[model samples]
Target chain A: FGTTSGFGTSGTSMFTDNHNPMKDIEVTSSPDDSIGCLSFSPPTLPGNFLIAGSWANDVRCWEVQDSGQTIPKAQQMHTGPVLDVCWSDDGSKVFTASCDKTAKMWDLSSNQAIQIAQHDAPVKTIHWIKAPNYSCVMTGSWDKTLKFWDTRSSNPMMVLQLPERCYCADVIYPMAVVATAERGLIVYQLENQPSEFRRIESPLKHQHRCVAIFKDKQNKPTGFALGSIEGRVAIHYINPPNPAKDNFTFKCHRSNSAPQDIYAVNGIAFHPVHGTLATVGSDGRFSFWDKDARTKLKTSEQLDQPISACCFNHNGNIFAYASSYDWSKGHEFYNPQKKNYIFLRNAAEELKPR
Target chain B: TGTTIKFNPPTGTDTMSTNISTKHQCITAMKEYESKSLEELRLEDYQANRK
Candidate 1:
C-alpha cells in the first residue's frame, strides 16, 4: 500500500529479478490534488508514460523509467479538475476532458493544447477514435450529449443527445457504449446499422459509474461490465450465446462488516492481454476478478483513501491505480492533506487464471 | 439524428451548465493552492478558518 523510491525506476527493475508479483511490489507518484482519471500511453509506445488528470487543473505525465533520474511534471490545460484523458490512436496527441466544460487536444510536438470546444457542461469522459475515412474525438458531458469533433474544424461532426447526463463511455471499432445518469446505457453502432443506437436499462438499482467493453474469443465486440455507485457490477452481453446464463451480477466490493455502508464503484479496468477485470471502490479496496470464471483472483490491501481510476500497461503486466478522494460526494469527506498517490504493481503475475 | 427514447422511469430531468474560466488567474489559482501547505487553504480546511 505504501511504496518508496523515486517514481518508476526501482519498480520496473524488480519485475525481472524473480520478483513476487503477488507480493504487492508497487511504484508510487502523486499529483498536486485528487486524481480524477488515468490513461497510459498506447502499449505500442516504448516508455512507461502514464498521464493522470488532477483536480488541480492540470494533467501530469510520468515516465516509469527503469533507470535514470525520474521526476513527475505536469502540463497545464483545464481551468478546473480534469475529468478524463485519452490518447490518439498513433500516440501523437492527447485529448483531455475537464469540469471546465472544455476538451483540449495536445500535440506532443507543440507544447500547448488547443481548446476543442466549450462544452455545455462539465465533460465527464473523452475518447479519440480513427474510422476508416476520418479521425475524430468523442466527448460525453454533464450536458447530456455525446459530440464528435475533428481537431482542425471548429464545428462538431455531430452531436447525439442522451437521455441523461453522460457519466462514462467505452468503444470498440464498430460499437460504442455510453453510461448515463439513472442507470441508462446507450449503445451506438458506428458501422451504419439501420437502427444506430439502442438504449438498455441497467438491472442494477444505482447510478452507473464506469464501463469496460469486452471482446469475444473471436475478437468481435461482445459486451461490457457496468459498475454502479452501490458497489455492484453487472456483466451484460450484446449478443449472448446463452441469454439466461450470459448476464449476471454479484456483490463483491461492499464491506462485509459495514452492511449498510455502501461504497461507490469508482473504477474498472481490464487487462489488455489477459482480459481479466479489476474493480476499485470508494471503500478504498481493489479486487481482481475473472469475468469468464466469475471468481475472485485476489484482493489488494485496501488503501486509506478511495481509488478514483485504474489501468493496465499494454503488456498487461503492470497495473496502475490512483488513490484519492471522490469529490462527487462533496466537501463532507474532503481532506486537504490526504497524500494522493498513483501506484503500479506487477498485477498480471497474480491475475493469471488459477 | 439518432432516436431519442425515454429512459425507464426517467429520473433527473434538469439541464446542466458550467462556470469555469480559461483565464490565466484561475489556472494560477489552482497552481497556488496545489503548491501551498494544506492549512493555508479555505475550502480545503474543514475548520472553515478564514477572515
Candidate 2:
C-alpha cells in the first residue's frame, strides 16, 4: 500500500521501549535490486518471516535472522513489486496486490498460489474484510472502487466505485476504510448481495497514510488513529450502536514535515495487549508512546533516508525495518557488508550504557 | 557482473515479485503484551494446524 526507504532513528525500537541495536547495521545497495516488504508472523519465524517482491517479477519469502536468509518458493516465478500483502484473519491465505494491476491469492496450506484478479489500477492496499459470518471478502483498489468478492466466485461479484483515486486502505473487519487521493477517507459497509456500498455520512480528514483501529473484546472498537503527512495523527473515539460520525476526535505529534510519501507511518504498532503505541517517521526518527509507555518514556532518533516502513510483528517484539535505499553511495543504516544490519549491532554499538 | 532493479508489481511484472503464524492476541484475555520492552514484544508461533 506504500513505499519506504529505511530512513529514521537508526537505533530506536518502536515496540521495545529501551531495546535498540546501538550500532547501525549499514546496508550498501547491491546491484541486484528487488521489490521488498516486511512482516513478522504472529510468532515470528527463526527471527521473523520477511517477504520481498523482486526484479525477477516474483515474490520471495525470507527467514529473517540476524542475517537475512531467503526461503525459496516452490515456484520462484511470480507476476509482479509484490505490492500490498496481507494475511487473512486466520493467517491462512497471503494476498498480494501487484503493479501487474492484479491481486494474487496464495494458500499457505498448499504452499501454492490459489488465485489472481485483474484490477483496473495497480492494487495498492489489500485489506481483508470478513463478511458477517466470514463468508465473503471486500477488496478496495487504486481503481477508486471497492470490489465485493465471494471466495466461491472468480470474477468479483460486484465493484464499489469511489470519488477519488485510491491508495492505502485496510479494514476493521466488517468496516472498511479507504484512503483516497481526493475526498480523504471513505468508510463503507458493503451491501450483501451486490457490489454497492452503504457509504459513510462523511469521510475522515483528507490525506490519510495509515489507520489503526483499537477494539475491545466483543469485536467493538474502542478508538482508532489516522496517520497523515501533516505529521498529525488523528484519533477518533469509536462508539458502537451509533453512526461513526458521532465519535470524538483528537490529534497528536504535530511535526515539521508531512507523514505521507514514505508511508512514513509505515512502521506503527500497538502492544498486542498493552496501552503503548509505536511509529517510525521519514523525519529519520522512530516514536514510541502510549499512556502505558507514558508520553515521557517515548524516544526518537534521526536516521539517514526517510524511514520507508516499520513493524513490531504480531508478537509485539522484534522491531524490523527495510531500507529502500540509494544505489550510488554508501547508505548509512543498511550496510551491504553485514547481515542483520538493522537488527544486530557490532560490539561497540551493542546495547551498552552510553 | 550483474545487478537488478525491482519495480512495484502490475507495473513492474508488467514488473515484479513477493508467512504468518499466531503467537496469540484476542479480546477474552486482557492480553496486551508489555510495550517499551523489545523482549516483551517477542511473539512465538502458535500455529499447530493453522493456515
What is the iRMS for every candidate structure? 17.8, 18.9
Per-residue alpha-carbon lDDT of candidate 2 for residues A209-283, written as tens digits (9 for 90 to 100): 566666665655455566653344654544545645445333333232122112224445554545356565545
- Indicate the TM-score of model 1: 0.79
Each prediction's RMSD to truth: 11.7, 15.5
CA shift of A96, model 2, Å:
0.2
Candidate 1 chain A weakest lDDT stretch, 10 residues = A1-10
**What value does the lDDT take at residue A76 in candidate 1?**
63
Considering only the true interface residues, what is the Cα RMSD of candidate 1 after superposition? Answer: 17.8
Q: Report the first chain's TM-score for all candidates.
A: 0.89, 0.67
C-alpha lDDT of residue A102 in model 1: 93
Of the candidates shown, which would achieve the greatest TM-score relative to the real structure? Answer: 1
